[PDB]
Design a binder for this molecule. Sequence first.
Ligand SMILES: CCCCNC(=O)NCc1ccc(CN2C(=N)N[C@](C)(CC(C)C)C2=O)cc1
Length: 386
Amino acid sequence: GSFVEMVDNLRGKSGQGYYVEMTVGSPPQTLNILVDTGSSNFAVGAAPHPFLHRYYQRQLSSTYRDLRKGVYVPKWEGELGTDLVSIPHGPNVTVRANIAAITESDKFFINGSNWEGILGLAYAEIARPDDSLEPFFDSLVKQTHVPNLFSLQLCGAGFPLNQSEVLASVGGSMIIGGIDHSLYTGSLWYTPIRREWYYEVIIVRVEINGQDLKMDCKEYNYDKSIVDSGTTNLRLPKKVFEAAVKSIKAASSTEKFPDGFWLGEQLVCWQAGTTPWNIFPVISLYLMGEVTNQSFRITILPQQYLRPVEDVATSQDDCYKFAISQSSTGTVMGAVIMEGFYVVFDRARKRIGFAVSACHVHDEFRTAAVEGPFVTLDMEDCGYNI
Ligand SMILES: CCCCNC(=O)NCc1ccc(CN2C(=N)N[C@](C)(CC(C)C)C2=O)cc1
């Protein structure tokens, strides 16, 4: 591991998000910021809010610059400006970046998440108000010698973290500008970034316990497939969700679960330590490789797709919610999927790499996997075109 200063710089969990500490302004104002690969704005609470115990105070920053422009994101509303920004446990550089000062929000801030802002790591094409508002990471690369690449190791604990535990627990690593080899095992496999807006990829095959879901592969990427640390669940296009759940139910049929469970609404609980991991199937997603007609697969365990939640009775049972849900906006590889892997966002080579995470939760019989190569034909046809 060559980036020790950035290792273990994240805190949080799949349900409320993973955040990194940042400073804004002069003198520096410390804030916890949500790491979000599904958006492109750097936005921070800038006014009192029931869920914020701190916020950005523009009038206290000598380096604050007002852009005299508003921003609306449906929801949070803010005022645009720029100021000096740093990441304490990151590259030792300070950059001037766009900052949306959030003055009004509805259902944005999560009570107890411990984060006061969001760091949108995706491309300018999806930045608000428009693509002229340069994203933080673009500013970082243009102003310093930091390589145009970042990598994420999101670490789920595999069990419920209480309010004090989640504050004292290491939730992972965001390595800015590099790849740290201590964060993964095995090999890194790269899939093309299809287009630079969201981190868009193409899924070419889906298996549940080795059984091909057998759908037209365009179904898997309807209308797009993205990697999004700001989303908790693995989200799947309606028809793919329906087929995947049918197959997961069939594989786990030795136990009957209520419809509320499959809807991701209700928790299921087992006596402490008796969770029947083995009756649940592994899920494999085949991703387009960098070599023509070649793919690789990432395989996740139920330890990833069943999200630990504290029993409504705080009892000693191990409880979980089904963390796979339907989408009307395409496939979303959210935090529960990212928890199984070390994910490399190689902006410079327009590719995303996957490797088994050194912190993924597993059991003595099965482990998450990243394997390849596999011969796969017509993968360009798996992409969706409006
Ligand atoms: C931080 C986790 C919140 C709870 N877990 C979810 O799964 N909640 C649903 C959900 C649906 C879609 C998105 C996509 N998404 C983002 N990735 N970023 C924004 C622009 C803002 C987000 C971060 C609030 C957004 O709407 C994000 C979250």
